């Protein structure tokens, strides 16, 4: 808060800050925020006369339990549901439903968090960056799930199993990944 006068200047009035800190006397506690310190200073510019200023700084902490209990827990929830479409077998028909639904919920929380945040480009919050990372990861999960669902429905009458998938995806990797038929 910058208090100064528009009529007079430093050559005609002083402006003496009395106490170093603003008092906290009739203060009602806000419930959402916490005042932690309230310093105040008097700004004058050398080699620039006719300048007076009294500024008060309010450094304010947040009581964070509301946005924690309403946004951080569903964030880690829908992120935890994203490395989970691969344990589901392709013999069932419910993979693409789960993948599209996880991407839908992530875009929903991104559009929700872009509303309570200010529209500035200093830096995105860590929630928005985290959801962007997880959203690109879920899109790669969709394209590799379609690729792994194409190879499930390959019949002997229409395809020929090449020798390189014979030597790679049948012998080496089921021993490398502890599968063992």
């Amino acid at each position: 808060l910058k208090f100064r006068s528009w009529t007079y200047d430093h050559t005609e009035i002083d402006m003496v800050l009395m106490t170093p800190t603003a008092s906290m006397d009739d203060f009602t506690p806000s419930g959402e925020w916490d005042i932690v310190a309230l310093p105040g200073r008097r700004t004058v510019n050398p080699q620039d006369p006719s300048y007076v200023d009294v500024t008060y700084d309010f450094i304010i902490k947040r009581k964070p339990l509301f946005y924690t209990i309403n946004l951080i827990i569903p964030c880690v929830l829908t992120t935890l549901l994203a490395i989970l479409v691969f344990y589901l077998p392709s013999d069932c028909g419910e993979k693409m439903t789960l993948c599209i639904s996880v991407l839908l919920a992530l875009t929903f929380f991104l559009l929700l968090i872009s509303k309570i945040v200010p529209p500035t480009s200093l830096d995105v919050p860590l929630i928005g960056k985290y959801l962007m990372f997880t959203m690109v990861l879920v899109t790669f999960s969709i394209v590799t799930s379609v690729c792994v669902l194409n190879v499930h429905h390959r019949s002997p009458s229409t395809h020929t199993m090449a020798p390189w998938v014979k030597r790679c995806f049948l012998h080496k990797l089921p021993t490398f990944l502890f599968m063992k038929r």
Binding site: T79, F133, T134, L137, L173, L177
Partner: peptide, 20 residues
């Protein structure tokens, strides 16, 4: 295979983001 790959990448991603 892609389960293990994306699990490892997601764990390193969470660590690298929430390092501070």
């Amino acid at each position: 295979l892609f389960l293990w790959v994306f699990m490892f990448v997601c764990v390193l991603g969470t660590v690298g983001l929430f390092l501070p």
